[PDB]
Amino acid sequence: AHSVKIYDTCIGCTQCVRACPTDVLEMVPWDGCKASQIASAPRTEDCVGCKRCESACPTDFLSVRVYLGAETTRSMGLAY
Amino acid sequence: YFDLGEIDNTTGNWDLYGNDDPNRYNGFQNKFFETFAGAFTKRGLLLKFLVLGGATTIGYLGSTSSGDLLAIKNGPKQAPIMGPRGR
Amino acid sequence: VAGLTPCKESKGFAKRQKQEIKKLEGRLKLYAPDSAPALAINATIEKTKRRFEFYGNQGLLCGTDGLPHLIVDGDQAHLGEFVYPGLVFLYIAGWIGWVGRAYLIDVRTSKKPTEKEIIIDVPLALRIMSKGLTWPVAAIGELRSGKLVEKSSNITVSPR
Amino acid sequence: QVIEPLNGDPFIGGLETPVTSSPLIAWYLSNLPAYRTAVAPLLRGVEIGLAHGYLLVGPFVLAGPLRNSAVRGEAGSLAAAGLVAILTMCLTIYGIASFKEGEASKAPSLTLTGRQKAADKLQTAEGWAGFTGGFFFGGLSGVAWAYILLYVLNLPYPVK
Amino acid sequence: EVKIMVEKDPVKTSFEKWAKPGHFSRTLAKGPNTTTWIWNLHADAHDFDSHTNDLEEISRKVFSAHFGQLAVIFIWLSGMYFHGARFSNYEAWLSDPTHIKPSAQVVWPIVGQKILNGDVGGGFQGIQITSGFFQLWRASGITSELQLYTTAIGGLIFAALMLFAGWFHYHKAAPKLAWFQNVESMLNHHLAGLLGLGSLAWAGHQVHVSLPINRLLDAGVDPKEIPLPHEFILNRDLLAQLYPSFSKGLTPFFTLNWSEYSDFLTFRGGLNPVTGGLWLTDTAHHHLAIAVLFLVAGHMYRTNFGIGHSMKEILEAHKGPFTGEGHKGLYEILTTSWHAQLAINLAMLGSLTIIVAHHMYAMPPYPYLATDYATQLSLFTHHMWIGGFLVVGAAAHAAIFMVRDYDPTTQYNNLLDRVLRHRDAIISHLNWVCIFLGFHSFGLYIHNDTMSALGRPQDMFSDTAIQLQPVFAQWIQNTHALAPSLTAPNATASTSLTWGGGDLVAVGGKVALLPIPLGTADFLVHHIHAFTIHVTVLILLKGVLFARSSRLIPDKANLGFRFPCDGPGRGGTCQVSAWDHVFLGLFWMYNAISVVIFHFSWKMQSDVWGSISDQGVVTHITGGNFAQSSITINGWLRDFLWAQASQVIQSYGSSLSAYGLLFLGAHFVWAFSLMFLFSGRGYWQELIESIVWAHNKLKVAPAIQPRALSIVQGRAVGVAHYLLGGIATTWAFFLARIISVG
Amino acid sequence: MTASYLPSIFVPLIGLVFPAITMASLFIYIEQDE
Amino acid sequence: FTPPTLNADTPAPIFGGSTGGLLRKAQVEEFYVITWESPKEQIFEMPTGGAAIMRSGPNLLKLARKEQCLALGARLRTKFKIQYQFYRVFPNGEVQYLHPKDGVYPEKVNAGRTAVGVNNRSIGQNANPAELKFAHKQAYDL
Numbered sequence A: 001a002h003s004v005k006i007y008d009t010c011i012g013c014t015q016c017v018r019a020c021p022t023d024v025l026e027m028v029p030w031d032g033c034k035a036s037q038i039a040s041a042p043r044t045e046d047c048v049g050c051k052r053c054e055s056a057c058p059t060d061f062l063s064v065r066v067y068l069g070a071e072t073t074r075s076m077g078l079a080y
Numbered sequence B: 001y002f003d004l005g006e007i008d009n010t011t012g013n014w015d016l017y018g019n020d021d022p023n024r025y026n027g028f029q030n031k032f033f034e035t036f037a038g039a040f041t042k043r044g045l046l047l048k049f050l051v052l053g054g055a056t057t058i059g060y061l062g063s064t065s066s067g068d069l070l071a072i073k074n075g076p077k078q079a080p081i082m083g084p085r086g087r
Numbered sequence C: 001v002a003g004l005t006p007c008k009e010s011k012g013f014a015k016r017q018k019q020e021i022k023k024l025e026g027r028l029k030l031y032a033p034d035s036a037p038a039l040a041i042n043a044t045i046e047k048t049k050r051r052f053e054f055y056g057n058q059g060l061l062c063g064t065d066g067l068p069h070l071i072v073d074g075d076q077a078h079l080g081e082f083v084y085p086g087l088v089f090l091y092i093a094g095w096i097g098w099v100g101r102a103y104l105i106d107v108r109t110s111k112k113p114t115e116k117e118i119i120i121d122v123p124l125a126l127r128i129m130s131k132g133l134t135w136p137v138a139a140i141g142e143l144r145s146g147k148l149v150e151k152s153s154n155i156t157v158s159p160r
Numbered sequence D: 001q002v003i004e005p006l007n008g009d010p011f012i013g014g015l016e017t018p019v020t021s022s023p024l025i026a027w028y029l030s031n032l033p034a035y036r037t038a039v040a041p042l043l044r045g046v047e048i049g050l051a052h053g054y055l056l057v058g059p060f061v062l063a064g065p066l067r068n069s070a071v072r073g074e075a076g077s078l079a080a081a082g083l084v085a086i087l088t089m090c091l092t093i094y095g096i097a098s099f100k101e102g103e104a105s106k107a108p109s110l111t112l113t114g115r116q117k118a119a120d121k122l123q124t125a126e127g128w129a130g131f132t133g134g135f136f137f138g139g140l141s142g143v144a145w146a147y148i149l150l151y152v153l154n155l156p157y158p159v160k
Numbered sequence E: 001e002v003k004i005m006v007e008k009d010p011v012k013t014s015f016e017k018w019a020k021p022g023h024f025s026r027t028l029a030k031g032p033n034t035t036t037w038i039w040n041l042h043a044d045a046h047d048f049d050s051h052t053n054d055l056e057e058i059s060r061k062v063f064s065a066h067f068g069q070l071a072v073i074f075i076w077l078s079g080m081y082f083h084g085a086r087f088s089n090y091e092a093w094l095s096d097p098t099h100i101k102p103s104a105q106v107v108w109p110i111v112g113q114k115i116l117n118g119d120v121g122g123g124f125q126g127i128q129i130t131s132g133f134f135q136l137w138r139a140s141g142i143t144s145e146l147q148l149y150t151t152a153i154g155g156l157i158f159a160a161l162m163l164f165a166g167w168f169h170y171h172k173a174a175p176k177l178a179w180f181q182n183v184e185s186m187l188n189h190h191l192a193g194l195l196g197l198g199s200l201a202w203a204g205h206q207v208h209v210s211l212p213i214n215r216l217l218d219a220g221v222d223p224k225e226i227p228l229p230h231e232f233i234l235n236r237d238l239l240a241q242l243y244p245s246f247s248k249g250l251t252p253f254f255t256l257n258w259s260e261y262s263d264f265l266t267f268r269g270g271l272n273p274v275t276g277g278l279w280l281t282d283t284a285h286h287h288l289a290i291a292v293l294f295l296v297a298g299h300m301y302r303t304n305f306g307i308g309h310s311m312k313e314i315l316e317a318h319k320g321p322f323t324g325e326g327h328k329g330l331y332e333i334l335t336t337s338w339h340a341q342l343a344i345n346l347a348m349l350g351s352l353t354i355i356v357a358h359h360m361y362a363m364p365p366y367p368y369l370a371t372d373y374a375t376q377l378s379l380f381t382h383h384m385w386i387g388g389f390l391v392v393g394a395a396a397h398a399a400i401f402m403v404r405d406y407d408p409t410t411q412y413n414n415l416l417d418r419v420l421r422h423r424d425a426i427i428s429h430l431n432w433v434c435i436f437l438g439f440h441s442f443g444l445y446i447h448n449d450t451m452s453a454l455g456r457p458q459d460m461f462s463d464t465a466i467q468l469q470p471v472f473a474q475w476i477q478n479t480h481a482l483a484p485s486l487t488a489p490n491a492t493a494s495t496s497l498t499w500g501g502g503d504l505v506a507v508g509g510k511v512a513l514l515p516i517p518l519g520t521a522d523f524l525v526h527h528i529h530a531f532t533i534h535v536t537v538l539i540l541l542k543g544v545l546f547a548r549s550s551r552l553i554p555d556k557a558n559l560g561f562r563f564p565c566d567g568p569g570r571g572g573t574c575q576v577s578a579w580d581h582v583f584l585g586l587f588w589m590y591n592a593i594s595v596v597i598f599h600f601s602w603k604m605q606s607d608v609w610g611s612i613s614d615q616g617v618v619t620h621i622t623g624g625n626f627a628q629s630s631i632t633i634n635g636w637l638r639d640f641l642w643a644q645a646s647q648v649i650q651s652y653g654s655s656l657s658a659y660g661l662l663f664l665g666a667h668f669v670w671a672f673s674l675m676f677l678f679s680g681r682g683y684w685q686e687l688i689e690s691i692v693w694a695h696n697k698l699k700v701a702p703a704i705q706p707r708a709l710s711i712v713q714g715r716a717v718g719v720a721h722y723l724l725g726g727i728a729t730t731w732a733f734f735l736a737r738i739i740s741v742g
Numbered sequence F: 001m002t003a004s005y006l007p008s009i010f011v012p013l014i015g016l017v018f019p020a021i022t023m024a025s026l027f028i029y030i031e032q033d034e
Numbered sequence G: 001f002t003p004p005t006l007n008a009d010t011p012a013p014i015f016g017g018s019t020g021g022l023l024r025k026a027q028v029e030e031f032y033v034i035t036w037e038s039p040k041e042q043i044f045e046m047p048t049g050g051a052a053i054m055r056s057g058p059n060l061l062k063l064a065r066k067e068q069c070l071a072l073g074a075r076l077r078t079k080f081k082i083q084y085q086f087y088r089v090f091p092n093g094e095v096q097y098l099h100p101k102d103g104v105y106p107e108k109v110n111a112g113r114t115a116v117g118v119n120n121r122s123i124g125q126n127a128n129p130a131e132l133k134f135a136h137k138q139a140y141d142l
């Protein structure tokens, strides 16, 4: 549904994963930062699109980026 | 309350107000309604004659109406009101 | 000029002076002549008569409504309507703009530059509010020396 | 002690309140023509039509525009029968959209208890087909019988 | 266990904490970095729960803030008595009030504003006041302006005492947490000591001061020759000539011969025909009764003397089979959360202020209150707006209790837990009754507008068309008029004149009150009122119930109260917060209270307020057009919003021209609100970025970065200008129209 | 007016029948699963 | 990492019933089951609205959305020291285990998971939309 993209400006601060309320983001190993980890979005079909990860990203400009695309019953947040 | 043997009973698929009574009428009342409402069954057929029959029945009494039945077919019954500037 | 009679010879402007005192004279009829609210209306009438004798003596132009109209084109007769108090204004408004600009330069080279804007340093402020008196000689002086404007390589620019 | 969860399950969005699972209310709601799961859906659709057909003559003969004439029986009954024919087409296009020809039944097969019942045939393409014709014949006869008992026989009532 | 717990010198009285602005919050103590720091400085200024987690220091902050509020109200009362003493015509109005308008504000003759000092009468120029202070001082027995000056300087003394107590109960001896948690003692000393002894003391004033002075004012005696209030206490024969029951001298009180006090303690009812205001023998019997009843009710709870009630024992014994473990933990709610008590107290104070508004137009308590129509309209309108604001704030602090003080571990299977457990049912059935009320009131208005537009007056809901007579109200008004004969014997007359007992009271040639009719128009507008109150309840109760979580956002309590949104996800989560429900309920309070005061103004300008000529003929201000024009929106726009606005727009060049200026400036503030309400932060942030670029070009960049207002702040600014502009529009239109035709 | 009865025909069809034709055919069309 | 199997014999927390629970999306589309092991009998805030007494052993809770499982799960990870996992249950009977996928929570890094949805460039090196007209690819997915 929603497309969440991680860019190489990430410092591995992990707070995009901690702010995620639908378990989209996970921290995979990486070689481009001091923390040696970058975020990724394997369960991007579960993304509501709330951009809590973009609110918690301290990198200017943002490393996690959520693009609101086709919206399904996962990304609409319904219970009915 | 999760079972893995009955998936409908653990998810809310309940007939909350349903009944399993097979019949409560008699054969004389049942044969009258299916005979009369037998040409009204098919959705594609019923949508055809309701649109075509509904367009005719509003154009009939729209046109055969009288002055007392509807005021738009009565017309004016007094002198017209002249506007300002002689118009 | 522009089809407007002068207000000293305008019959409509003298009509508005007549019907303004008459409104205030009828307000005076229900008070005692030595009472305190009657002294306020008597001071209002003398304020009105001072106003109408000031508007006619400045060469104001009155239309068909009996009202003084301002000519802002830059006429040699009409300098005090727009040009003279505009140059008085822009001197005062440039004084506000020069002492607020010079305060920000004086607090940008400080230890905590953001605490000097919520808490304005009055000895730093009052020593340049006096310096805003001669500001056209200091604004064009900074314009000619290049200190008024900042080069675009050191200015935060949003991307295309 | 009085309020229970819905069939003992607290995580289904409902409660077993007295307005829901009374001895009198759950007897009532289980005999209403919409919740008979084994009756053929044309027969129980005639009762859903007779009811709604009858009741709708009332607000159309006592409140409509032609309520102050001698044609108030004829104007309001055909207005009541007009709402039957519109809602029949609303019932027609609902069954076309919701149910496809040859599909299963979108109905809960399980009852309040754990016993397995047959699927409700009303939520099908052919079950809602016979339900729509049951509402059309029942609704047009429910309007006409309420018109007969009010403006043909003219039974005495306080308001008519 | 109830006793005084204080401790000495918690914080030192120093100005070093005045210099640092954001000392209360950890985020604002670092100093400013953006311009949003200034707005969070004011937003978190009074929010004492966000400062510290210790409820003791929070309660001390709230107690000294109460004392500062009391100081501000005493400064305000000092000003209004000093304005009566020096800048008013209160002695001139008190000589004859049927011809001289109440005025207590003189403006300075500077810029043409001296025309606002209008001819109010009595040889005086000033702003005609509508606050009702003149009738209040006439009911208090105030005869001279020296008494007003003495009350002003006494109020200044009490304002200094409240400032000293606010300093004392935060810096010298501040109470501890268990002192504030003695709610039984606080209720015992508020019911008996505050509302009981206050009613008893005002009853003593209304026996000795208000009653004989106001009896002499009904006799046409000049107030300069009326004896002073202490002369009735000293010379009791002077008090006995007006009431012979004073000749017995306190012996019927202790011998239970209270009927011998029937000369000055009566259950008359109705209005004084001399003045148009309630009797003070009834207002003194009223205060003596609510004092002998609030002092009884103040001996109910258990402090430390054995007798009484623990209210936890009252609550925990109140449990039912439809609830189970209900009312348990609510004592722990209402003694550990300031916001829950604030919600209950604000709901009662707002609803009580609405009670005050109705029980003052209908039973006017002050002499010449009813016949001064400006005072009646302004007092009703002011108390409706205060009451609506306080009930919206009640729902606000209810929601703040949910998001910041509701502990789910202490609340299992009680009333609050079960109300949260079926909040979908509450909000959905409230939604149904709101939509049903909206059609069955406003669509009835639309139907009347349509058939009046289509030339069908018989197809409407009129008193001549299809009638919708309020038979319950028309029966309860007959039940309240035909009461004295059988259900309430000992009454001389009836409770109010608006019930149907006759008594066309004419004071100064102007109608005080008469029987208020209730017809189809009143039915329609009362269903509008019920609809608007229900919808305001719907947004506000939805914000209270969905403050913790929702089906949309299950972690909404972690986001807080003043958060804007979660984001553009789940379709968009804009205004999910409980604050945003308070924000929308403020608009629905505008709608509700504005239609309430519009129905009030038109209903009594059409059916109550007017004049009485010879041979008993009553000519109202807008004669009889409420029954036929207030059933359509075109009548409301035409015979109310256009016909009665023909004195707010042509008031220019007169004393009421400031009402025209504030009418237009109130339209300005309203259209200014629509800038903040309809727009959003990011547009203004990029526009400010362009302005910051222009500042960078000329080296006038501030170090405090210019930022757009926050989304919560932009909505707050928009609703503040919407309420301020619309309320000031109605204030200007009301206070120009009813002053002009009054 | 030449023919007064075509007001009595076309205003009921284009005002009542044609929205009932168009909205019912669209609601079938917008809820086709295809 | 072997995913845990849903036992379907552990019981529910003591809850009086809520109206915020499973609607018809549970019956036809999906519903979410969260399973966790408890130290003792506690009281927790229900993410559908309300409070329930959680059991002294393993607990099973049926939820409608994936966000309700994290809102509950982060509540009993910070207030309580309880490890949790949840599932996705479909009406045909298939239980899809969802979190944590490797057995360790996604805040902590694991060597088994791979980078997906990761761009080696930044935002400023994304291509303009004018040079990607009429293509399935967009400015960020390449």
Ligand code: CLA
Residues within 6 Å of the ligand: E063, E066, E067, E070, E161, E179, E180, E182, E183, E185, E186, E189, E190, E192, E193, E194
């Ligand atoms: C019989 C004693 C008594 C009485 C008269 C009151 C009266 C009052 N209380 Mg108090 N209170 C008492 C004892 C009493 N209290 C007890 C025992 C407790 C402890 C459990 C509390 C704790 C409490 C708190 C925590 C607060 C109050 C507040 C209030 C005020 C109500 C708000 C208001 O605007 O009212 C109308 C206000 C007035 C009429 C002003 C009157 C002020 C004068 C100086 C009297 C007050 C002094 C003292 C209480 C009684 C002295 C009597 C004196 C006249 C002889 C009012 C001053 C509230 C307030 O505003 O805080 C300041 C507040 O929330 N009370």
Ligand code: CLA
Residues within 6 Å of the ligand: E042, E043, E044, E045, E046, E047, E048, E342, E346, E389, E390, E392, E393, E394, E396, E397, E400, E561, E562, E579, E582, E583, E586, E720, E724
């Ligand atoms: C008994 C009265 C009472 C109590 C104790 C409080 C107490 C509180 N309120 Mg409030 N509340 C109440 C009633 C009250 N309120 C009412 C009347 C409303 C409806 C408007 C609400 C709605 C409510 C909400 C919506 C929220 C609170 C919150 C706050 C908290 C701090 C706000 C702050 O720092 O002030 C800030 C003060 C200002 C910004 C001053 C602005 C004043 C108004 C808005 C504009 C000016 C009006 C003025 C008359 C017009 C003059 C114009 C002229 C100058 C040109 C605090 C707990 C906030 C909070 O976080 O609570 C924890 C918040 O989010 N309140």
Ligand code: CLA
Residues within 6 Å of the ligand: B050, B051, B054, B055, B057, B058, B061, B070, D064, D065, D066, D075, D076, D078, D079, D081, D082, D083, D085, D086, F011, F012, F014, F015, F016, F017, F018, F020, F021
């Ligand atoms: C251009 C649009 C259109 C037209 C032609 C009409 C026409 C009519 N309206 Mg209606 N209306 C419409 C739009 C329309 N409406 C909309 C948009 C609104 C919503 C705001 C309303 C709201 C409204 C209400 C609330 C009511 C009317 C009523 C009326 C009737 C007034 C004349 C009379 O006295 O008959 C008196 C009545 C009769 C002669 C009864 C005739 C009923 C016939 C026989 C129905 C027959 C079946 C029908 C044709 C099936 C339709 C199929 C489908 C294809 C359209 C008339 C039938 C009144 C009425 O009586 O409704 C029937 C009434 O109560 N209107």
Ligand SMILES: CC1=C(/C=C/C(C)=C\C=C\C(C)=C\C=C\C=C(C)/C=C/C=C(C)/C=C/C2=C(C)CCCC2(C)C)C(C)(C)CCC1
Residues within 6 Å of the ligand: E662, E664, E665, E666, E668, E669, E724, E725, E727, E728, E731
């Ligand atoms: C000074 C100045 C200026 C001016 C200004 C202007 C421009 C104006 C605007 C304004 C407007 C254009 C409007 C406004 C309006 C106002 C208002 C509106 C206000 C209000 C206030 C208040 C305070 C209120 C009160 C109230 C209340 C609160 C409630 C009830 C009612 C009332 C009213 C009483 C300028 C800038 C030039 C320059 C600088 C300075």
Ligand SMILES: CC1=C(C/C=C(\C)CCC[C@H](C)CCC[C@H](C)CCCC(C)C)C(=O)c2ccccc2C1=O
Residues within 6 Å of the ligand: E675, E676, E677, E679, E680, E681, E684, E685, E707, E708, E709, E710, E711, E713, E714, E715
């Ligand atoms: C206009 C507007 C702004 C911009 C508002 C701003 C920047 C507030 C301006 C406040 C004053 C005018 C600036 C600060 C003034 C200083 C005290 C300096 C004094 C200068 C003169 C006022 C004397 C928003 O941020 C916004 C956010 C969300 C929705 C709508 C809107 C919105 O409509």
Ligand code: SF4
Residues within 6 Å of the ligand: A006, A009, A010, A011, A012, A013, A014, A015, A016, A017, A038, A039, A053, A056, A057, A058, A059, A062, A063, A064
């Ligand atoms: S929050 Fe931003 S910087 Fe931190 S790990 Fe996530 S993407 Fe990287």
